[PDB]
Short mmCIF file of C-alpha atoms (C1' of nucleotides) and ligand atoms in Angstrom, two decimals:
data_model
loop_
_atom_site.label_atom_id
_atom_site.label_comp_id
_atom_site.label_asym_id
_atom_site.label_seq_id
_atom_site.Cartn_x
_atom_site.Cartn_y
_atom_site.Cartn_z
CA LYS A 28 -25.81 -16.87 32.60
CA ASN A 29 -22.30 -18.11 33.26
CA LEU A 30 -21.94 -19.03 29.45
CA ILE A 31 -23.07 -15.36 28.69
CA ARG A 32 -20.44 -13.91 31.15
CA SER A 33 -17.65 -15.97 29.52
CA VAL A 34 -18.25 -15.21 26.04
CA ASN A 35 -18.69 -11.54 26.98
CA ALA A 36 -15.14 -11.51 28.49
CA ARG A 37 -13.57 -12.64 25.04
CA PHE A 38 -15.97 -10.98 22.58
CA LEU A 39 -18.39 -8.23 23.76
CA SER A 40 -16.26 -6.59 26.31
CA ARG A 41 -13.23 -6.57 24.05
CA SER A 42 -15.03 -4.86 21.26
CA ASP A 43 -12.50 -2.24 20.78
CA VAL A 44 -9.52 -4.43 20.21
CA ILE A 45 -11.44 -6.74 17.90
CA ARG A 46 -12.39 -3.75 15.71
CA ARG A 47 -8.78 -2.79 15.51
CA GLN A 48 -6.57 -5.70 15.52
CA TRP A 49 -5.09 -6.96 12.12
CA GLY A 50 -3.67 -10.31 11.62
CA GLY A 51 -1.29 -12.28 9.50
CA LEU A 52 2.26 -11.20 9.00
CA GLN A 53 3.57 -14.39 10.20
CA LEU A 54 6.79 -15.78 9.05
CA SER A 55 7.56 -19.29 8.21
CA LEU A 56 9.65 -21.48 10.53
CA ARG A 57 12.58 -21.53 8.27
CA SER A 58 12.25 -17.71 7.66
CA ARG A 59 12.29 -17.22 11.70
CA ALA A 60 15.21 -19.41 11.98
CA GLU A 61 17.34 -17.68 9.11
CA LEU A 62 16.64 -14.24 10.88
CA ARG A 63 17.69 -15.64 14.21
CA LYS A 64 20.69 -17.13 12.61
CA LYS A 65 21.63 -13.99 10.91
CA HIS A 66 21.15 -11.68 14.11
CA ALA A 67 23.75 -14.21 15.89
CA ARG A 68 26.30 -13.97 13.25
CA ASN A 69 26.09 -9.97 13.23
CA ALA A 70 25.78 -9.84 17.09
CA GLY A 71 28.51 -7.76 18.09
CA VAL A 72 29.99 -6.44 15.00
CA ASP A 73 29.44 -2.87 16.16
CA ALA A 74 31.12 -2.81 19.52
CA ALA A 75 33.97 -0.63 18.08
CA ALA A 76 31.79 2.02 16.93
CA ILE A 77 30.23 2.66 20.56
CA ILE A 78 31.99 5.58 22.30
CA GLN A 79 31.17 4.06 25.82
CA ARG B 23 -0.35 -39.76 8.31
CA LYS B 24 0.85 -42.57 6.20
CA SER B 25 4.33 -43.05 4.70
CA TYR B 26 4.94 -42.82 1.03
CA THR B 27 8.13 -44.31 -0.38
CA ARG B 28 7.59 -43.09 -3.78
CA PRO B 29 8.41 -39.65 -4.93
CA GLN B 30 5.06 -39.08 -6.63
CA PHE B 31 1.54 -39.79 -5.70
CA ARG B 32 -0.54 -42.50 -7.51
CA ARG B 33 -4.33 -43.13 -7.04
CA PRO B 34 -5.11 -45.80 -4.18
CA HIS B 35 -6.80 -48.90 -5.20
CA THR B 36 -10.28 -48.76 -3.99
CA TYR B 37 -13.50 -51.27 -3.89
CA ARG B 38 -14.99 -51.89 -7.41
CA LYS B 39 -18.41 -53.36 -7.15
CA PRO B 40 -18.55 -55.35 -10.62
CA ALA B 41 -21.18 -54.70 -13.21
CA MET B 42 -24.23 -56.84 -13.24
CA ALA B 43 -25.39 -58.77 -16.44
CA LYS B 44 -28.48 -56.79 -17.74
CA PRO B 45 -31.63 -58.61 -19.26
CA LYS C 13 41.82 -43.99 17.54
CA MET C 14 42.79 -46.74 20.17
CA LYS C 15 46.33 -45.22 20.62
CA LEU C 16 44.69 -41.78 21.18
CA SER C 17 42.20 -43.18 23.69
CA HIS C 18 44.90 -44.91 25.76
CA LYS C 19 47.16 -42.04 25.52
CA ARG C 20 44.39 -39.81 27.02
CA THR C 21 43.78 -42.06 29.88
CA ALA C 22 47.31 -42.48 30.87
CA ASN C 23 47.69 -38.70 30.65
CA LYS C 24 44.46 -38.53 33.19
CA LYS C 25 46.39 -40.98 35.39
CA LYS C 26 49.83 -39.16 35.15
CA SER C 27 48.35 -35.76 35.74
CA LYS C 28 46.06 -36.90 38.68
CA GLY D 12 7.31 -9.92 -51.92
CA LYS D 13 7.77 -13.29 -50.35
CA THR D 14 8.89 -14.64 -47.00
CA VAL D 15 12.73 -14.38 -46.75
CA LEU D 16 14.78 -17.41 -46.02
CA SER D 17 15.67 -16.51 -42.68
CA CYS D 18 12.15 -16.15 -41.60
CA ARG D 19 11.04 -19.29 -43.19
CA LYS D 20 13.56 -21.21 -41.22
CA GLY D 21 11.70 -20.16 -37.94
CA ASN D 22 8.68 -22.36 -39.17
CA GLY D 23 10.92 -25.49 -38.63
CA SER D 24 9.72 -27.83 -41.17
CA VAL D 25 12.84 -29.09 -43.23
CA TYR D 26 15.27 -27.03 -41.36
CA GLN D 27 15.16 -28.69 -38.16
CA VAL D 28 17.88 -30.72 -36.41
CA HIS D 29 18.87 -34.08 -37.91
CA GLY D 30 18.76 -35.75 -34.49
CA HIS D 31 18.46 -39.43 -35.86
CA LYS D 32 21.77 -41.32 -34.82
CA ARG D 33 22.45 -38.93 -32.21
CA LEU D 34 22.88 -40.47 -28.61
CA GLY D 35 21.03 -37.94 -26.65
CA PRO D 36 21.52 -34.95 -24.77
CA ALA D 37 24.91 -34.69 -22.83
CA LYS D 38 24.63 -33.49 -19.11
CA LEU D 39 26.04 -33.77 -15.76
CA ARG D 40 24.08 -36.20 -13.38
CA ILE D 41 21.39 -34.78 -11.26
CA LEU D 42 22.20 -32.65 -8.35
CA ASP D 43 21.10 -34.85 -5.86
CA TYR D 44 21.74 -35.51 -1.98
CA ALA D 45 24.69 -37.29 -2.50
CA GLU D 46 26.24 -34.58 -4.65
CA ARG D 47 25.45 -31.88 -2.37
CA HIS D 48 27.01 -33.64 0.92
CA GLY D 49 29.43 -36.32 -0.19
CA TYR D 50 30.57 -37.64 -3.48
CA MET D 51 29.35 -40.37 -6.20
CA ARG D 52 32.22 -42.61 -7.67
CA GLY D 53 31.51 -43.46 -11.38
CA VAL D 54 33.41 -45.39 -14.15
CA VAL D 55 34.10 -44.31 -17.43
CA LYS D 56 32.84 -47.22 -19.65
CA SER D 57 33.07 -45.90 -23.29
CA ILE D 58 33.94 -42.87 -25.30
CA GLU D 59 31.98 -42.41 -28.09
CA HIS D 60 31.28 -39.97 -31.01
CA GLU D 61 27.97 -38.32 -32.02
CA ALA D 62 26.99 -36.85 -35.39
CA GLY D 63 27.12 -33.14 -35.42
CA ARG D 64 29.33 -33.15 -32.41
CA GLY D 65 33.15 -32.25 -32.41
CA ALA D 66 33.57 -33.30 -28.65
CA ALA D 67 33.88 -36.79 -27.69
CA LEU D 68 31.01 -38.11 -25.39
CA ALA D 69 31.62 -40.20 -22.25
CA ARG D 70 29.50 -43.10 -20.92
CA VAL D 71 29.78 -42.89 -17.31
CA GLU D 72 28.26 -45.81 -15.08
CA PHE D 73 26.98 -44.92 -11.51
CA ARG D 74 25.19 -46.99 -8.94
CA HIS D 75 21.85 -45.70 -8.11
CA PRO D 76 21.80 -44.01 -4.79
CA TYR D 77 18.41 -45.46 -3.55
CA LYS D 78 17.91 -48.65 -5.92
CA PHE D 79 19.69 -51.68 -6.58
CA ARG D 80 20.45 -50.72 -10.24
CA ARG D 81 23.07 -48.68 -12.48
CA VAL D 82 22.41 -45.29 -13.82
CA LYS D 83 24.99 -44.85 -16.95
CA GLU D 84 24.99 -41.18 -17.46
CA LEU D 85 26.32 -39.42 -20.77
CA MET D 86 28.41 -36.35 -20.39
CA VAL D 87 30.78 -34.34 -22.79
CA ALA D 88 34.26 -36.08 -22.07
CA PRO D 89 37.16 -33.51 -21.02
CA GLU D 90 40.39 -33.97 -22.85
CA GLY D 91 42.19 -36.88 -21.15
CA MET D 92 39.06 -39.01 -20.14
CA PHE D 93 39.80 -42.74 -20.66
CA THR D 94 38.00 -45.86 -20.35
CA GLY D 95 38.13 -47.35 -16.66
CA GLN D 96 38.89 -43.95 -15.28
CA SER D 97 37.08 -43.20 -11.95
CA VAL D 98 35.13 -40.13 -11.92
CA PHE D 99 34.09 -38.34 -8.66
CA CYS D 100 31.20 -36.04 -8.59
CA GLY D 101 30.13 -34.18 -5.15
CA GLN D 102 30.94 -31.76 -2.79
CA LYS D 103 33.85 -34.03 -1.47
CA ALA D 104 35.22 -34.81 -4.68
CA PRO D 105 39.00 -34.27 -5.22
CA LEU D 106 40.46 -31.73 -7.66
CA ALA D 107 41.40 -33.70 -10.57
CA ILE D 108 40.52 -33.71 -14.23
CA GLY D 109 37.24 -35.51 -15.05
CA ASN D 110 35.65 -34.97 -11.53
CA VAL D 111 32.75 -32.96 -10.89
CA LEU D 112 32.73 -30.25 -8.09
CA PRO D 113 31.01 -27.19 -6.65
CA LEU D 114 32.53 -24.15 -8.13
CA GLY D 115 33.21 -23.01 -4.45
CA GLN D 116 35.15 -25.98 -4.03
CA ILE D 117 37.72 -25.30 -6.90
CA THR D 118 40.60 -23.05 -6.50
CA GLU D 119 40.96 -19.78 -8.41
CA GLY D 120 42.76 -19.97 -11.71
CA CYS D 121 41.65 -23.41 -12.41
CA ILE D 122 40.46 -24.47 -15.74
CA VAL D 123 37.00 -25.89 -15.97
CA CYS D 124 34.43 -26.99 -18.47
CA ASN D 125 30.76 -28.12 -18.34
CA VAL D 126 30.02 -25.30 -16.24
CA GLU D 127 26.49 -25.02 -14.84
CA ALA D 128 25.03 -21.59 -15.33
CA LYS D 129 22.31 -22.29 -12.75
CA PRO D 130 22.96 -24.87 -9.94
CA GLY D 131 21.39 -27.95 -11.07
CA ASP D 132 20.97 -27.17 -14.75
CA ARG D 133 23.62 -29.99 -15.37
CA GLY D 134 26.05 -28.04 -17.46
CA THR D 135 25.38 -25.22 -20.03
CA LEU D 136 28.57 -23.47 -20.58
CA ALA D 137 31.99 -24.52 -22.38
CA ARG D 138 30.77 -27.49 -24.01
CA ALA D 139 32.16 -27.27 -27.62
CA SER D 140 35.37 -28.77 -28.53
CA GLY D 141 38.41 -27.33 -27.04
CA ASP D 142 36.59 -24.77 -24.96
CA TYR D 143 37.05 -24.12 -21.37
CA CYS D 144 36.28 -21.57 -18.46
CA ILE D 145 38.60 -19.80 -16.05
CA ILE D 146 37.71 -19.36 -12.52
CA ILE D 147 38.68 -15.53 -11.70
CA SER D 148 37.82 -15.28 -8.31
CA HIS D 149 35.33 -16.32 -5.34
CA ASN D 150 33.18 -13.83 -3.10
CA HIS D 151 31.92 -15.52 -0.10
CA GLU D 152 29.98 -12.76 1.09
CA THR D 153 27.62 -12.95 -1.94
CA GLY D 154 28.48 -16.73 -2.56
CA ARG D 155 29.32 -16.06 -6.16
CA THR D 156 32.12 -17.24 -8.46
CA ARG D 157 33.48 -15.09 -11.27
CA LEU D 158 34.30 -16.67 -14.43
CA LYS D 159 36.12 -16.00 -17.91
CA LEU D 160 33.78 -17.64 -20.55
CA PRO D 161 35.36 -18.98 -23.60
CA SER D 162 33.93 -15.84 -25.70
CA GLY D 163 36.03 -13.63 -23.29
CA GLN D 164 33.09 -12.14 -21.49
CA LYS D 165 33.03 -12.37 -17.56
CA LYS D 166 30.05 -13.92 -15.63
CA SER D 167 29.21 -14.38 -12.13
CA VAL D 168 27.42 -17.63 -10.93
CA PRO D 169 26.27 -19.10 -7.82
CA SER D 170 29.04 -21.09 -6.04
CA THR D 171 26.81 -24.27 -5.63
CA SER D 172 26.87 -24.62 -9.54
CA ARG D 173 28.96 -27.36 -10.50
CA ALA D 174 31.93 -27.67 -12.98
CA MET D 175 33.83 -30.32 -14.58
CA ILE D 176 37.83 -30.01 -14.19
CA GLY D 177 39.56 -29.79 -17.45
CA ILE D 178 38.84 -28.74 -21.32
CA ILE D 179 36.38 -30.16 -23.49
CA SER D 180 37.93 -32.88 -25.84
CA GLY D 181 38.69 -32.59 -29.69
CA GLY D 182 40.13 -29.35 -29.61
CA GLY D 183 41.88 -27.85 -32.68
CA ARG D 184 39.21 -29.11 -35.23
CA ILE D 185 38.75 -25.78 -36.79
CA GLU D 186 42.52 -25.65 -37.63
CA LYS D 187 42.18 -28.00 -40.75
CA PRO D 188 41.09 -26.69 -43.98
CA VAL D 189 38.13 -28.13 -45.39
CA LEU D 190 39.32 -28.10 -49.19
CA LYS D 191 36.06 -29.41 -50.46
CA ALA D 192 32.57 -28.64 -50.78
CA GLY D 193 31.89 -32.60 -50.41
CA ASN D 194 33.47 -32.40 -47.05
CA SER D 195 31.01 -29.50 -45.85
CA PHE D 196 28.14 -31.61 -47.21
CA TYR D 197 29.20 -34.35 -44.91
CA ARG D 198 29.79 -31.89 -42.06
CA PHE D 199 26.32 -30.39 -42.11
CA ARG D 200 24.64 -34.07 -42.82
CA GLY D 201 24.55 -34.50 -38.93
CA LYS D 202 23.70 -30.99 -38.05
CA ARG D 203 20.86 -29.48 -40.07
CA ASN D 204 19.88 -28.14 -43.48
CA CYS D 205 21.47 -25.02 -43.77
CA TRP D 206 24.40 -25.72 -46.45
CA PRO D 207 24.98 -24.57 -49.18
CA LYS D 208 24.40 -20.85 -48.53
CA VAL D 209 23.08 -18.51 -51.42
CA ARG D 210 24.05 -14.89 -51.21
CA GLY D 211 21.13 -12.40 -50.79
CA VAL D 212 22.38 -10.21 -53.68
CA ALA D 213 22.15 -13.25 -56.02
CA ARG D 214 18.56 -13.80 -55.22
CA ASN D 215 15.61 -11.79 -56.84
CA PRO D 216 14.19 -8.67 -54.88
CA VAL D 217 10.94 -10.54 -54.28
CA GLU D 218 12.66 -12.88 -51.74
CA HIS D 219 15.29 -10.60 -50.45
CA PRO D 220 16.15 -6.96 -49.67
CA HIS D 221 19.48 -7.36 -51.41
CA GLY D 222 18.15 -8.85 -54.55
CA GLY D 223 17.91 -7.40 -58.02
CA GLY D 224 19.49 -4.58 -59.98
CA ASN D 225 21.20 -4.53 -63.14
CA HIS D 226 24.37 -4.97 -61.27
CA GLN D 227 24.98 -7.42 -58.10
CA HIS D 228 24.86 -4.81 -55.29
CA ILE D 229 23.28 -3.88 -52.21
CA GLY D 230 21.79 -0.62 -53.07
CA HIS D 231 21.16 0.56 -49.51
CA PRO D 232 23.38 0.27 -46.29
CA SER D 233 23.77 -3.33 -44.99
CA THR D 234 23.46 -2.26 -41.21
CA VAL D 235 20.05 -2.68 -40.11
CA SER D 236 18.31 -1.31 -37.12
CA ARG D 237 17.79 -3.57 -34.03
CA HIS D 238 14.09 -2.81 -34.28
CA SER D 239 13.81 -3.84 -37.90
CA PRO D 240 10.88 -6.33 -38.42
CA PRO D 241 11.69 -9.74 -39.59
CA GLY D 242 12.14 -9.79 -43.43
CA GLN D 243 13.76 -6.54 -43.19
CA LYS D 244 16.37 -7.56 -40.60
CA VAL D 245 18.90 -8.99 -42.88
CA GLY D 246 22.49 -7.99 -43.27
CA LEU D 247 24.67 -6.70 -40.48
CA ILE D 248 22.32 -6.42 -37.68
CA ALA D 249 22.53 -3.57 -35.28
CA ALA D 250 26.22 -3.38 -36.11
CA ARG D 251 28.27 -0.89 -33.74
CA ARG D 252 30.97 -1.05 -36.36
CA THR D 253 32.11 -2.39 -39.57
CA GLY D 254 35.17 -2.97 -41.63
CA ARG D 255 38.45 -4.84 -41.02
CA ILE D 256 39.31 -4.74 -37.29
CA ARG D 257 42.77 -3.40 -36.56
CA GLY D 258 44.76 -3.14 -33.16
CA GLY D 259 42.80 -5.67 -31.12
CA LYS D 260 39.64 -7.64 -31.13
CA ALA D 261 37.05 -6.32 -28.57
CA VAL D 262 35.12 -9.00 -26.59
CA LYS D 263 31.74 -9.55 -28.86
CA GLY D 264 28.33 -9.66 -27.16
CA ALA D 265 25.87 -7.66 -25.13
CA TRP D 266 27.62 -5.23 -22.57
CA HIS D 267 27.06 -6.33 -18.96
CA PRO D 268 28.70 -3.88 -16.28
CA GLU D 269 28.06 -6.37 -13.64
CA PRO E 25 -2.07 -34.09 -6.03
CA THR E 26 -2.94 -30.56 -6.97
CA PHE E 27 -5.88 -30.19 -4.81
CA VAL E 28 -3.63 -31.19 -1.93
CA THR E 29 -0.89 -28.71 -2.98
CA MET E 30 -3.52 -26.08 -3.23
CA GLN E 31 -5.11 -26.40 -0.10
CA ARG E 32 -1.74 -26.21 1.93
CA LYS E 33 -0.60 -23.38 0.05
CA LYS E 34 -3.95 -21.63 0.88
CA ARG E 35 -3.41 -21.71 4.49
CA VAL E 36 0.25 -20.47 3.85
CA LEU E 37 -1.13 -17.35 1.92
CA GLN E 38 -3.70 -16.72 4.74
CA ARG E 39 -0.99 -16.56 7.42
CA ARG E 40 1.82 -14.49 5.27
CA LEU E 41 -0.45 -11.65 4.18
CA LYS E 42 -1.98 -8.90 6.45
CA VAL E 43 -5.40 -9.82 7.55
CA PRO E 44 -8.02 -7.09 8.06
CA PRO E 45 -9.79 -7.13 11.38
CA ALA E 46 -12.99 -8.19 10.12
CA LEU E 47 -11.43 -11.56 8.76
CA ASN E 48 -8.88 -11.68 11.73
CA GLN E 49 -11.63 -11.84 14.34
CA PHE E 50 -12.78 -15.31 13.30
CA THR E 51 -9.25 -16.47 14.27
CA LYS E 52 -9.55 -15.44 18.00
CA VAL E 53 -11.99 -18.33 18.87
CA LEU E 54 -13.61 -19.02 22.31
CA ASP E 55 -11.53 -21.13 24.61
CA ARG E 56 -12.04 -24.91 24.59
CA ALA E 57 -13.63 -25.41 27.99
CA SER E 58 -16.55 -22.56 27.35
CA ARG E 59 -16.91 -23.99 23.88
CA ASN E 60 -17.56 -27.44 25.15
CA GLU E 61 -20.02 -25.93 27.45
CA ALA E 62 -21.79 -24.03 24.94
CA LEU E 63 -22.13 -26.82 22.64
CA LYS E 64 -23.36 -28.92 25.40
CA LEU E 65 -26.23 -26.62 26.08
CA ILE E 66 -26.96 -26.41 22.25
CA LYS E 67 -27.08 -30.36 22.28
CA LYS E 68 -29.55 -30.18 25.24
CA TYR E 69 -31.92 -27.70 23.23
CA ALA E 70 -31.33 -29.23 19.89
CA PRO E 71 -34.37 -29.19 17.53
CA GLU E 72 -36.64 -32.06 17.35
CA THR E 73 -36.19 -34.55 14.35
CA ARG E 74 -38.48 -35.30 11.59
CA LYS E 75 -39.75 -38.51 13.68
CA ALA E 76 -40.26 -36.48 16.81
CA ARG E 77 -42.12 -33.60 15.26
"C1'" C F 10 9.35 37.12 -1.09
"C1'" U F 11 13.85 33.52 1.64
"C1'" C F 12 15.61 29.60 4.95
"C1'" G F 13 16.15 26.78 10.01
"C1'" G F 14 13.42 22.89 12.84
"C1'" A F 15 9.62 19.72 15.33
"C1'" A F 16 5.62 15.80 15.73
"C1'" C F 17 2.29 14.84 15.06
"C1'" G F 18 -1.22 12.00 9.88
"C1'" U F 19 -0.49 10.90 4.76
"C1'" U F 20 2.65 10.63 0.46
"C1'" G F 21 5.30 11.70 -4.49
"C1'" C F 22 9.32 8.97 -5.29
"C1'" U F 23 13.56 6.14 -3.47
"C1'" U F 24 17.98 2.98 -0.42
"C1'" C F 25 18.36 -1.43 2.28
"C1'" A F 26 16.55 -5.78 4.36
"C1'" C F 27 12.66 -9.36 3.73
"C1'" U F 28 8.89 -13.28 1.25
"C1'" U F 29 3.86 -14.96 0.09
"C1'" A F 30 2.39 -12.70 -5.63
"C1'" U F 31 5.28 -13.45 -10.02
"C1'" C F 32 9.05 -15.29 -13.18
"C1'" G F 33 13.48 -18.70 -14.57
"C1'" A F 34 15.48 -23.31 -14.13
"C1'" A F 35 15.83 -28.66 -12.20
"C1'" U F 36 14.03 -33.18 -10.34
"C1'" G F 37 10.67 -39.88 -11.29
"C1'" A F 38 8.81 -32.73 -7.28
"C1'" A F 39 14.54 -38.11 -3.38
"C1'" G F 40 16.04 -36.31 1.89
"C1'" A F 41 14.26 -28.51 2.87
"C1'" G F 42 14.89 -25.86 7.54
"C1'" A F 43 15.26 -26.35 12.84
"C1'" C F 44 17.01 -29.19 17.08
"C1'" C F 45 23.38 -25.04 17.79
"C1'" A F 46 16.98 -21.44 19.86
"C1'" A F 47 14.59 -15.33 18.93
"C1'" U F 48 14.30 -8.84 17.45
"C1'" G F 49 9.60 -16.06 17.53
"C1'" G F 50 4.73 -19.14 18.65
"C1'" G F 51 1.23 -19.86 22.35
"C1'" U F 52 -4.97 -18.71 26.64
"C1'" U F 53 -6.87 -25.63 21.72
"C1'" U F 54 -1.01 -28.06 26.41
"C1'" A F 55 0.39 -22.71 28.51
"C1'" G F 56 1.28 -21.15 32.63
"C1'" C F 57 3.20 -17.84 36.48
"C1'" G F 58 4.25 -13.05 37.73
"C1'" U F 59 5.05 -7.66 38.07
"C1'" A F 60 4.13 -2.19 36.24
"C1'" G F 61 0.98 0.85 33.73
"C1'" U F 62 -3.79 1.31 30.95
"C1'" C F 63 -8.94 -0.08 29.88
"C1'" U F 64 -13.26 -2.75 31.42
"C1'" U F 65 -20.03 -4.66 29.54
"C1'" C F 66 -16.30 -6.37 35.89
"C1'" G F 67 -16.39 -11.84 32.97
"C1'" G F 68 -11.35 -10.20 31.35
"C1'" G F 69 -8.40 -7.52 28.22
"C1'" C F 70 -4.65 -4.17 25.96
"C1'" U F 71 0.59 -2.31 26.29
"C1'" A F 72 5.27 -3.34 27.83
"C1'" U F 73 8.63 -6.19 30.69
"C1'" G F 74 10.51 -10.99 33.38
"C1'" C F 75 10.19 -16.44 34.31
"C1'" A F 76 8.77 -20.84 32.32
"C1'" C F 77 6.69 -24.05 28.09
"C1'" C F 78 6.54 -25.26 22.42
"C1'" G F 79 12.11 -27.32 22.43
"C1'" U F 80 14.59 -33.12 21.11
"C1'" C F 81 19.34 -36.01 19.27
"C1'" U F 82 23.84 -36.60 16.82
"C1'" A F 83 29.25 -38.67 12.88
"C1'" G F 84 33.77 -36.81 13.77
"C1'" G F 85 37.88 -33.73 16.35
"C1'" U F 86 39.97 -32.05 21.44
"C1'" U F 87 40.23 -32.59 26.85
"C1'" U F 88 37.65 -33.65 31.85
"C1'" G F 89 35.63 -37.30 35.41
"C1'" G F 90 34.30 -42.54 36.29
"C1'" G F 91 34.32 -48.49 36.54
"C1'" A F 92 36.08 -53.41 34.92
"C1'" G F 93 36.70 -58.22 31.97
"C1'" U F 94 43.95 -62.03 26.35
"C1'" C F 95 42.62 -67.24 25.48
"C1'" C F 96 42.99 -72.38 22.62
"C1'" C F 97 45.86 -75.40 19.75
"C1'" C F 98 51.27 -75.80 19.32
"C1'" U F 99 57.93 -70.25 17.24
"C1'" G F 100 53.31 -70.21 14.42
"C1'" U F 101 47.66 -70.70 13.74
"C1'" G F 102 42.41 -69.74 15.16
"C1'" G F 103 38.88 -67.09 18.30
"C1'" G F 104 38.12 -62.80 21.04
"C1'" U F 105 38.98 -58.12 24.66
"C1'" A F 106 40.49 -53.06 25.09
"C1'" C F 107 34.91 -49.08 28.01
"C1'" C F 108 31.19 -45.17 29.60
"C1'" C F 109 29.76 -40.07 30.64
"C1'" A F 110 30.67 -34.91 30.63
"C1'" A F 111 32.65 -29.97 28.39
"C1'" C F 112 34.22 -26.93 23.58
"C1'" C F 113 34.33 -27.12 18.05
"C1'" G F 114 31.69 -29.42 14.21
"C1'" U F 115 26.52 -29.97 11.78
"C1'" G F 116 23.70 -34.47 9.99
MG1 LIG G 313 13.25 -31.38 -34.78
MG1 LIG G 314 27.31 -18.40 -51.52
MG1 LIG G 315 19.35 -14.04 -61.20
MG1 LIG G 316 11.86 -5.55 -51.02
MG1 LIG G 317 19.97 -5.24 -55.07
MG1 LIG G 318 30.10 -8.81 -58.05
MG1 LIG G 319 28.80 -6.82 -55.35
MG1 LIG G 320 12.45 -32.16 -6.38
MG1 LIG G 321 20.24 -29.28 6.29
MG1 LIG G 322 25.83 -27.08 19.21
NA1 LIG G 323 25.56 3.48 -56.93
#
RNA sequence: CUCGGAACGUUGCUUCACUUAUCGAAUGAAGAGACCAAUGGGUUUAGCGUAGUCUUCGGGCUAUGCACCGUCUAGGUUUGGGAGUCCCCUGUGGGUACCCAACCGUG
């Protein structure tokens, strides 16, 4: 009975989420690092275009 | 994992039972 | 390198 | 009809390179870790001549970066290379004739040779005797370097691609008249079976489009289409123009607006 | 070896591409503690062997 | 018959950015990237919250915070601290002049 309750929490009661959730689209560590570095380089290159 | 000091993989040597002399 | 280290330490004691 | 000579050569057979007595391909050393970060210092041990090549070749001895042994690379020697000269190859190599440096490290306006078209290709441009490339400019945003190739065309390459400082040795070879068919015979002995040359109009029509006729003549225009099949594509292939050039030689080759 | 390279590259291609929910649901497994409890119950009620039968 | 807009759902093309298909090189596939830290990952070492929104009432989902994954350095510059010149004879031999922190730098 406890096992049934536990597995229902993860799988049965979450049916709507499980039916809709797409997976994948995960970047590599090197790709994630490259994106982070690029954002840091171009961090504040647009401060002069802000009216405020 | 092991450590490989060579740039290409080569077949490891495994145990080889010798053939028996047939009648 | 040793000359720079001694000068840095001498400046430290001089400033303090 | 029969197969044209230009098509027959594609089969290989007796028209292949006379590679015997050649010392081997000439190249820069492998773009390894030492080149990408520091430098490798070698010594020029010998300057040697290879049949079929006008440029002199240099044997350069390096230590093996990972093993207790020597490497003994073989490169196209620039003009001025001498035995006992120290050759520096790497990111930190100084700007001097004979050294191999990444293009991004070389100042604009410098004269280079043994240029890598692709990083790590070990030298594919400006290799024939007396030839060189000129560094036009560097573009750090895209990491490219613009070069003037010996033919006059401008080409952009990655800045990590290497080049050798100087011009290829043995320049001025084509300035001396041959004066004899025999000298051409010896010239082509080390290259391939492509000499002497028989004109197409002197052949029979069975073996060449220009053959035959009661007068030695091409009876059709000699400018042929780019799309002509082999055997028909002889003469002036896809010529944009003909006749004596006057008022300036334009740069030949395909048009690359980039 | 080729089989080594392919089995690693297979995992990469499975993570880089877009996985539909039917296949993606199998990557969202039960937690470790509940998994151990479930397998303990399964082991307790394991089928009889050839000998015991 | 002619134009103006949503904001939803889908798309005929197309700019830019990307990388895993694919293609080109090079290498004895010999040193990639990060540690310098997200617009990342994580309930199978991640956890703690909060606010909405669902729940088969077990717990999720969406956001948003905090923490974990998560670690070090040559060299350059400046900030604190402690703690050990001598034999043989002017010359000779042996040896001591450090540690940590901050910024740049990136192996
Ligand atoms: Mg051949
Ligand atoms: Mg002739
Ligand atoms: Mg005849
Ligand atoms: Mg004909
Ligand atoms: Mg004719
Ligand atoms: Mg004539
Ligand atoms: Mg004629
Ligand atoms: Mg490799
Ligand atoms: Mg690196
Ligand atoms: Mg840092
Ligand atoms: Na005529």
